[PDB]
Design a binder for this molecule. Structure first.
Ligand SMILES: [Ca+2]
Ligand SMILES: [Cl-]
Lengths: 10, 440
């Protein structure tokens, strides 16, 4: 379960 | 900006005073009483109906330049009004939206009678809702606070057309209508909290339906109780002539932009989850006026005013989350896609909710399997001419998007099996949804 490229945290 | 100008008026005589914002109002009150030839005890000094105590300063009461102090003949607990039930019901419902044994006053409404108007205010310390009701019948100025839910329920429980008379008796508020009598416990109006004033930075008016579209397009993508507190809210952004909302929980993002017909400075704030909920409650005639400050937001709707603190954090840039070159475009009817995903979801894993999409020339196959080894398969005609690919998704996130797109056809913009998908109305770029896939 990958995440959106949120910076930080993904 | 160290001193304040104040007007004191008894309805006929007006006296003006310049005092330091830190000086108690006692000297001002006694001087006004002296000019009237009246005893200091024989008058009560009300600020928006709330009784001033002699040791309080303008700074304590957040007074501003040319604010007015009304001198009234003494009337202990003098507030009195009589209003039609129908004129109170919606105001009471609205302000009772936003309560601890250590904070009983937060379960109360502040009532203020002043300048021909009844004001009702509810607050939870971080947001407040204020309603103004014109008083058509005789009244007497003053203020109190009263249990919100009990007062609302009493007014709602009275018969259609009832007139509701309210006055104060010691530490209780007496409500009378017909041969119905209620005595409610009060707490002092002077003890009700009030957000201090702030400067509006961007201000604009827009139709209620436009704000409602912006919130409904993205609200479902907000995080719930995320430790990244900024994600629990909704970004509100002004840019050029558009207003934009953004919401994300790290697995999906929603962004919606709408034109507001006036070019504005660029501004970007985070509205807390409970504020978004209250904003929606107000969007029941006339349009909506929004003021955004550095730390607060305010919405004016009809005779209501909502104010909320903002969330102080760094919201992610949706522009960096959008797929860079989503060159594989699938188009399908929104309802047909939604109904197929909804049936496939029945046999997906109850925890992980994964479904598999196989895209091929003008065809989509959706499959779902669960630990019981049950299987669903749906085949749909779509418009698609890209490379074949298999990609997995949390079907709940997909259904959430399709339900928020209230449209005939949707476009899914694909890159590869491990990259986010962008979903939009095939006919409108106003909203965009980005969903990360699950690995297979
Ligand atoms: Ca009536
Ligand atoms: Cl269309």
């Amino acid at each position: 379960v990958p995440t959106l490229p949120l910076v930080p945290x993904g | 900006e160290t001193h304040i100008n104040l007007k004191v008026s008894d309805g006929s005589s007006e006296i003006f005073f310049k005092i330091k914002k830190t000086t108690p109002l006692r000297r001002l009150m006694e001087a006004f009483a002296k000019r009237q030839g009246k005893e200091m005890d024989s008058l009560r000094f009300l600020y928006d109906g709330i009784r001033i105590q002699a040791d309080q300063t303008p700074e304590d009461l957040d007074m501003e330049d040319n604010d007015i102090i009304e001198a009234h003949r003494e009337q202990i607990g003098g507030m009195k009004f009589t209003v039609e039930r129908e004129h109170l019901l919606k105001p009471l419902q609205q302000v009772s939206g936003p309560g601890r044994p250590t904070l009983p006053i937060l379960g109360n409404l502040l009532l203020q009678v002043a300048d021909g108007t009844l004001s009702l205010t509810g607050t939870d310390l971080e947001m407040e809702m204020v309603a103004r009701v014109a008083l058509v019948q005789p009244h007497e100025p003053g203020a109190t606070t009263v249990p919100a839910r009990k007062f609302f329920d009493i007014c709602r429980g009275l018969p259609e057309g009832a007139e509701i008379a309210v006055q104060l008796e010691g530490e209780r508020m007496l409500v009378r209508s017909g041969r119905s009598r209620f005595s409610l416990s009060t707490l002092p109006a002077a003890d009700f909290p009030n957000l201090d004033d702030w400067q509006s930075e961007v201000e604009f008016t827009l139709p209620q339906a436009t704000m409602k579209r912006l919130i409904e397009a993205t609200q479902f993508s907000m995080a719930h109780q995320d430790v990244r507190y900024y994600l629990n809210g909704m970004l509100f952004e002004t840019e050029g002539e558009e207003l934009r909302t953004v919401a994300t929980d790290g697995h999906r993002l929603a962004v919606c932009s709408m034109p507001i017909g006036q070019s504005l400075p660029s501004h970007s704030v985070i509205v807390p989850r409970k504020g978004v909920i209250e904003l929606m409650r107000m969007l029941d005639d006339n349009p909506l006026r929004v003021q955004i400050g550095s730390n607060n937001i305010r919405a004016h709707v009809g005779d209501f005013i909502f104010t909320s603190k903002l969330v102080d954090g760094r919201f992610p840039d949706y522009r960096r989350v959008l797929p860079k070159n989503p060159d594989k475009h699938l188009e399908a009817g929104c309802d047909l896609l939604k109904q197929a995903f909804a049936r496939a979801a029945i046999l997906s894993n109850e925890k992980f909710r994964g479904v598999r999409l196989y895209v091929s020339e003008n065809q989509l196959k959706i499959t779902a399997n669960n630990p019981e080894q049950e299987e669903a398969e749906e085949i749909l005609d779509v418009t698609y001419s890209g490379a074949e690919m298999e990609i997995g998704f949390n079907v709940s996130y997909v259904l959430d998007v399709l339900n928020a797109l209230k449209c005939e056809n949707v476009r899914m913009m694909l890159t590869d099996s491990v990259s986010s998908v962008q979903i939009e109305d095939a006919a409108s770029q106003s909203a965009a949804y980005v969903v990360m896939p699950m690995r297979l």
